């Protein structure tokens, strides 16, 4: 019953997977918009009159 | 805790008021269970205190830092203990660490008992007690750092424990806490440490350098703002 | 083959003056003349120009007059004034290529076989160079069979001698923003380049629309070229490429971080010096 | 300065004289009690 | 036919769509590259093959529309990010 309550696959007898992989995040997409804004802000602060 | 969590520290104070706020927040966390943030805030404070004066303040932060790190399974560096301004003010903690490394409950009890009233006076006793039942943690972190995979029976032999189930459980709880990075696998009966990942290839370096660059530009804007040309005063 | 063609500001301004004078005369939509210059081993050098009376029938693109006798007389007089310059080609101020162009070029081709045509628009609604250069070549097809003469575009730019540079920079006191620093390398590009790319892509899209809607026929060399274009476009989801991009961005960041540290230290030093100077001035004043 | 007179320093009641006062580098490992490394090698050889 | 992203065939698929045994497939692609039909390489270890480009081929009035739609996507992207640059960079470049 307790195994049922939790998210356990309930494999072979006394054999349940916990999915410790955590999906193993490997995908990467090069977030650019943020990087472009960051760089333009460097340039802004660099050239404004302070 | 409620008060601090609700009010906001103004970002323009002295060095000294920042040091005091940081010490109190560090102490309040260490009294609760968030050890790592307490360690971080404390080191920030110690790095923000006046250089020459505040011998008592440095003493306070250093003793609390020692206790918290010990509570974290790391080993604080021996450089400080021989500094003149904190040499004789930490001998209790010197013996304490000598005990925590080569864990000997006999020696831990001897040092706690003898230098007991002093610990209580400092305002830490509770934490050093929290240590006394965590003396194993140092050993398990050492075993992980040293070995990339070890059989559980070997751990039991190395930690002077009872049947290897106790060590099994302690290791599992540890990895749960986050002090160690590994994966247990009993069907062969060995705990396996996780490989080393390449930090540079990720985007961490970009983020860190961006933060630091922002700080530097802000320093410059402030610095050129502070100028006053009063020759027409 | 010409690797490059360099026009001089005087030529551009002279063509603009020509178009203004004729339009003031009116009843025209294009102008035609010559171009004088020399060669520097495949790096042309256009340096001067003069007019040549010309007229055309807008309705039918097979009627036109171009007083070549005027061209020969003016070549005589100019060659009397400056020997080092010989005819190089011909220019016209119509917006875009006309149908007569091959006819005129074959007429012009007598004076200079290696004749390059330079179109100088005088009303730029765009963000880009004001000139386009074209060289007439025979084109043999795999299926298009008959061999005609088509214009092949050749790289062009603007160049000036010290005297012209001085004069132009003097006249350019109507707007001026140098800021050679980051401001220029971010207005002259990034924005400018993106705007130009967008305009070009929009022209390609208009033509594609026209073909698809039947208003035109299909051209196979264009379709093959567009297929190659779409095949060139890189993919940015390859772990190898992401890894390389992050590595290089990181190096660039460490350098900018060092630069900012340097600058902060210098500005702080300046503040300290100003403070010390103020304190000394007060103490001396007190 | 803002001397933290609020916080107290350590009492100088005992203030025992320095035992050795050595200042070379301290280092953590020096506390450990080894067994005369040569002795460990000799015992190894005896046991093989 | 394979979409641009994948475009990574397998020997077995060659052998099944050309009616040739796997052993003799390699010579086919080797020759195809040699003549000038497709550029790429071969992975004998993994029995795969990467085709970086295929000879241009005439397209009917349907694939023309697909190519036009891809161009629309391209133009929209370009304008979006031109706007991002200009707006975020307004103050300096007025």
Curated annotation (Swiss-Prot), chain A:
Transmembrane regions listed in the UniProt entry: none
Family: Belongs to the proteasome subunit S14 family.
Purpose: Component of the 26S proteasome, a multiprotein complex involved in the ATP-dependent degradation of ubiquitinated proteins. This complex plays a key role in the maintenance of protein homeostasis by removing misfolded or damaged proteins, which could impair cellular functions, and by removing proteins whose functions are no longer required. Therefore, the proteasome participates in numerous cellular processes, including cell cycle progression, apoptosis, or DNA damage repair.
Oligomeric and partner information: Component of the 19S proteasome regulatory particle complex. The 26S proteasome consists of a 20S core particle (CP) and two 19S regulatory subunits (RP). The regulatory particle is made of a lid composed of 9 subunits including PSMD8, a base containing 6 ATPases and few additional components. Interacts with DDI2. Interacts with TASOR.
Name listed for the protein in its UniProt record: 26S proteasome non-ATPase regulatory subunit 8
Gene: PSMD8
Swiss-Prot record, chain B:
Family per record: Belongs to the proteasome subunit S3 family.
Protein name: 26S proteasome non-ATPase regulatory subunit 3
Superkingdom classification of source: Eukaryota
GO aspect biological process, one term: regulation of protein catabolic process
Residues recorded as bearing Phosphoserine in the entry: 151, 163
GO-annotated molecular function: enzyme regulator activity
Full protein: residues contained: 268 to 500 of 534
Functional note: Component of the 26S proteasome, a multiprotein complex involved in the ATP-dependent degradation of ubiquitinated proteins. This complex plays a key role in the maintenance of protein homeostasis by removing misfolded or damaged proteins, which could impair cellular functions, and by removing proteins whose functions are no longer required. Therefore, the proteasome participates in numerous cellular processes, including cell cycle progression, apoptosis, or DNA damage repair.
UniProt keywords, alphabetically: Isopeptide bond, Phosphoprotein, Proteasome, Ubl conjugation
Gene Ontology, cellular component aspect: cytosol; extracellular exosome; extracellular region; ficolin-1-rich granule lumen; membrane; nucleoplasm; nucleus; proteasome accessory complex
Assembly: Component of the 19S proteasome regulatory particle complex. The 26S proteasome consists of a 20S core particle (CP) and two 19S regulatory subunits (RP). The regulatory particle is made of a lid composed of 9 subunits including PSMD3, a base containing 6 ATPases and few additional components. Interacts with UBQLN1 (via ubiquitin-like domain). Interacts with ERCC6.
Residue ranges annotated for the PCI domain, each copy included: 19-198
UniProtKB/Swiss-Prot annotation, chain C:
Pfam short name (any one): MitMem_reg
MF terms (GO), sorted A to Z: protein homodimerization activity
Covalent link Glycyl lysine isopeptide (Lys-Gly) (interchain with G-Cter in ubiquitin), residues: 176
PTM annotation (N6-acetyllysine): residues: 200, 210
Source superkingdom: Eukaryota
Span of domain MPN: 5-140
PROSITE patterns: MPN
GO biological process: proteasome-mediated ubiquitin-dependent protein catabolic process
GO cellular component, one term: nucleoplasm
Keyword check for Transit peptide: no
UniProt entry keywords in alphabetical sequence: Acetylation, Isopeptide bond, Proteasome, Ubl conjugation
Coiled coil: none
Family: Belongs to the peptidase M67A family.
Leftover remarks: Does not bind a metal ion.
Assembly, per entry: Component of the 19S proteasome regulatory particle complex. The 26S proteasome consists of a 20S core particle (CP) and two 19S regulatory subunits (RP). The regulatory particle is made of a lid composed of 9 subunits including PSMD7, a base containing 6 ATPases and few additional components. Within the complex, PSMD7 interacts with subunit PSMD4 through their respective MPN domain. Interacts with TRIM5.
Main function: Component of the 26S proteasome, a multiprotein complex involved in the ATP-dependent degradation of ubiquitinated proteins. This complex plays a key role in the maintenance of protein homeostasis by removing misfolded or damaged proteins, which could impair cellular functions, and by removing proteins whose functions are no longer required. Therefore, the proteasome participates in numerous cellular processes, including cell cycle progression, apoptosis, or DNA damage repair.
Protein name: 26S proteasome non-ATPase regulatory subunit 7
Originating organism: Homo sapiens (Human)
From Swiss-Prot, chain D:
Signal sequence segment: none
UniProt KW Nucleus keyword: yes
Coiled coil: none
GO cellular component, one term: proteasome complex
Expression tissues: Expressed in limb bud, craniofacial primordia and skin.
Gene Ontology biological-process annotations: double-strand break repair via homologous recombination; mRNA export from nucleus; proteasome assembly; proteasome-mediated ubiquitin-dependent protein catabolic process
Keyword Nucleus applies: yes
Cell location: Nucleus
Keywords in alphabetical order: Nucleus, Proteasome
Function of the protein: Component of the 26S proteasome, a multiprotein complex involved in the ATP-dependent degradation of ubiquitinated proteins. This complex plays a key role in the maintenance of protein homeostasis by removing misfolded or damaged proteins, which could impair cellular functions, and by removing proteins whose functions are no longer required. Therefore, the proteasome participates in numerous cellular processes, including cell cycle progression, apoptosis, or DNA damage repair.
Family: Belongs to the DSS1/SEM1 family.
Protein name per the record: 26S proteasome complex subunit SEM1
Source organism of the structure: Homo sapiens (Human)
Lineage summary: Eukaryota, Metazoa, Chordata, Craniata, Vertebrata
């Amino acid at each position: 019953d307790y195994a049922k309550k939790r998210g356990w696959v309930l494999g072979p007898n006394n054999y349940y997977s916990f999915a410790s992989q955590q999906q193993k995040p490997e995908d990467t997409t090069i977030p650019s918009t943020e990087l472009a804004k960051q760089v333009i802000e460097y340039a802004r602060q660099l050239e404004m009159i302070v | 805790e409620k008060l601090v969590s609700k009010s906001v520290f103004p970002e323009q104070a002295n060095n000294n008021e920042w040091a005091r706020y940081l010490y109190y927040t560090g102490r309040i966390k260490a009294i609760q269970l968030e050890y790592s943030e307490a360690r971080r805030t404390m080191t920030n404070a110690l790095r923000k205190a006046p250089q020459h004066t505040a011998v008592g303040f440095k003493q306070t932060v250093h003793k609390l830092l020692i206790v918290v790190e010990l509570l974290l399974g790391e080993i604080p560096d021996r450089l400080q203990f021989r500094q003149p301004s904190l040499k004789r003010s930490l001998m209790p903690y010197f013996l304490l660490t000598q005990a925590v490394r080569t864990g000997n409950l006999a020696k831990f009890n001897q040092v706690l008992d003898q230098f007991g009233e002093k610990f209580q006076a400092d305002g830490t006793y509770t934490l050093i007690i929290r240590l006394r039942h965590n003396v194993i943690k140092t050993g398990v972190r050492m075993i992980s750092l040293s070995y990339s995979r070890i059989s559980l029976a070997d751990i039991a032999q190395k930690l002077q424990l009872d049947s290897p189930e106790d060590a099994e459980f302690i290791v599992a709880k540890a990895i749960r806490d986050g002090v160690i990075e590994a994966s247990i696998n009993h069907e062969k009966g060995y705990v396996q440490s996780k490989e080393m990942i390449d930090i540079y290839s990720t985007r961490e370096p970009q983020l860190a350098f961006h933060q630091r660059i922002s700080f530097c530009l802000d320093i410059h804007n402030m610095s050129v703002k502070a100028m006053r040309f009063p020759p027409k005063s | 083959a010409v690797q490059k063609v360099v026009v001089h500001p005087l030529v551009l301004l002279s063509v603009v003056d020509h178009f203004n004078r004729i339009g003031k005369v009116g009843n025209q939509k294009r102008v035609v003349g010559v171009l004088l210059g020399s060669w520097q081993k495949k790096v042309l050098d256009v340096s001067n120009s003069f007019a040549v009376p010309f007229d055309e029938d807008d309705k039918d693109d097979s009627v036109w007059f171009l007083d070549h006798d005027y061209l020969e007389n003016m070549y005589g007089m100019f060659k009397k004034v400056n020997a080092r310059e010989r005819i190089v080609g011909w220019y016209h101020t119509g917006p875009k290529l006309h149908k007569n162009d091959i006819a005129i070029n074959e007429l012009m081709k007598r004076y200079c076989p290696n004749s390059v045509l330079v179109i100088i628009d005088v009303k730029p609604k765009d963000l880009g160079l004001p000139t386009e250069a074209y060289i007439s070549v025979e084109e043999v097809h795999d299926d298009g069979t008959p061999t005609s003469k088509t214009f092949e575009h050749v790289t062009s730019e603007i160049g000036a001698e010290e005297a012209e540079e001085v004069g132009v920079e003097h006249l350019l006191r109507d707007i001026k923003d140098t800021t050679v620093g980051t401001l220029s390398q971010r207005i002259t590009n990034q924005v400018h380049g993106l705007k130009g790319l967008n305009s070009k892509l929009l022209d390609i899209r208009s033509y594609l629309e026209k073909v698809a809607t039947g208003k035109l026929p299909i051209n196979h060399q264009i379709i093959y070229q567009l297929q190659d274009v779409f095949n060139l476009l890189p993919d940015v989801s390859l772990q190898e490429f992401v890894k390389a991009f992050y590595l290089k961005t990181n190096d660039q960041m460490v350098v900018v971080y060092l630069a900012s540290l340097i600058r902060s230290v210098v500005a702080l030093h300046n503040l300290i010096n100003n403070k010390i100077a103020n304190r000394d001035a007060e103490k001396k004043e007190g | 300065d803002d001397e933290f007179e609020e916080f107290p320093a350590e009492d100088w009641a005992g203030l025992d004289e320095d035992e050795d006062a050595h200042v070379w580098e301290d280092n953590w490992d020096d506390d450990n009690v080894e067994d005369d490394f040569s002795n460990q090698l000799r015992a190894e050889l005896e046991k093989h | 036919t394979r979409p641009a992203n994948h475009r990574q065939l397998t020997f077995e698929e060659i052998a099944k769509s050309a009616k040739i045994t796997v052993n003799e497939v390699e010579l086919l692609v080797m020759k195809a590259l040699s003549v000038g039909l497709v550029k790429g390489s071969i992975d004998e270890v993994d029995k795969r093959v990467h085709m970086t480009w295929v000879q241009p081929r005439v397209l009917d009035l349907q694939q023309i529309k697909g190519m036009k739609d891809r161009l629309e996507f391209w133009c929209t992207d370009v304008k979006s990010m031109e706007m991002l640059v200009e707006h975020q960079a307004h103050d300096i470049l007025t």
